[PDB]
């Protein structure tokens, strides 16, 4: 198994890594339907998004995609400094694969 | 896909944002049938609700209403600024359809 | 819609407003079969209870009645200063229906 | 319904109150297959567990079984001070029915 | 049974315990699929893991492996000494089956 976010990163397809080792700046959330959707930046403008669950999201991603939202909410809140994110670039904000906190 | 919740919310009808910057002054919540709600207010006076489970709500829908709901709690009891709020202005307290959070 | 539990304790058969503006005193949780049930007492020696999830009633109301177990038992962690409750006076132990918290 | 822990401990059968006055000392948590176990410690030596969810507890009794290890958590990581624990004594370690915690 | 991570660790096979003494140094969350994993780090390099779900782990299992990465999260989070890890030593990086954390 991949050690590690970068190694781990490398095995899929439309991925790059942003090391960001800085806390998020601002966390969006929005219910409104289509678009179950949580945005966060950092200070230099980067915007990243947990892509909504479409189809292309079985029912073994729902969870771990539900996961990765109430990660992001908290790492806000408690002001945790992100490492490194693992984006897919084929998408606009990009979409976080992986993340990895670091204190 | 909208880069923020000003342009998430215009995306939406009778949807209005509604600048904070401040913290929840006070969060309210029922359990009293079929209006499972959740009212906050801020210091200014605005009192904003999420909506109540139910009809049009499918699955996707009625569990980022549960998210929203657990937002806003940590959010007040952490004492979070909630910068914007877009809100359905058609409703009476407004409902909330995005917030976003900063710093 | 009411915009805060006064109002909103008014709507429902035989409740009643508690003004605490204290913090919980201590909270109590037992899992022994069939009473599963959370108290909380304030230092005043109010005591209350949250509902115990029937069949009876649908299963929005029983994700209601656990939610509120956690805000109680979050709001008693943190110290948060509860405003009112709203409880229903046919029952001893007071059941809970409605809780403000505000600084 | 009982108000208080002594009383609802005295509603069952080989239940016993512990006075512990004082925070946990370790948690254990272990996934390992069929001893899905959580594990708690006092300085005092005194150990209590929460008996694995198995396939005769009723709907509600899962539910509340998990919420209980939730709490116990929780009260480890912010070092809440736990006044008493309502154990059944027919078990090793002592397997909790109910926890109560003040200031 | 047993009552301690290690009488706990010694009933399964290929289990070595590891005594750490430390909080966790970075957590790795990934939701990329297949890779749903959970990877954390201590100061000296040291490097585990949660074991993605499967068919292998019956639903109870899946949910002992969720509670499980939250345990990790907000121990990281609060950076809270992880005392020993029971884990299995026949993956790599080795796959985590108890945790014990201790003031």
């Given at each position: 198994?991949?050690?590690?976010?970068?190694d781990?990163?490398?095995?899929?397809?439309?991925?790059?890594?942003?090391?960001?080792?800085?806390?998020?700046?601002?966390?969006?959330?929005?219910?409104?339907?289509?678009?179950?959707?949580?945005?966060?930046?950092?200070?230099?403008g980067?915007?990243?998004?947990?892509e909504?669950?479409?189809?292309?999201?079985?029912?073994?991603?729902?969870?771990?995609?539900?996961?990765?939202?109430?990660?992001?909410?908290?790492?806000?809140?408690?002001?945790?400094?992100?490492?490194?994110?693992?984006?897919?670039?084929?998408?606009?904000?990009?979409?976080?694969?992986?993340?990895?906190?670091?204190?």
């Amino acid at each position: 198994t991949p050690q590690n976010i970068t190694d781990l990163c490398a095995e899929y397809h439309n991925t790059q890594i942003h090391t960001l080792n800085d806390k998020i700046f601002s966390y969006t959330e929005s219910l409104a339907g289509k678009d179950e959707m949580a945005i966060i930046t950092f200070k230099n403008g980067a915007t990243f998004q947990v892509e909504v669950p479409g189809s292309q999201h079985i029912d073994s991603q729902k969870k771990a995609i539900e996961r990765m939202k109430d990660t992001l909410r908290i790492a806000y809140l408690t002001e945790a400094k992100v490492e490194k994110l693992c984006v897919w670039n084929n998408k606009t904000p990009h979409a976080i694969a992986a993340i990895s906190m670091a204190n």
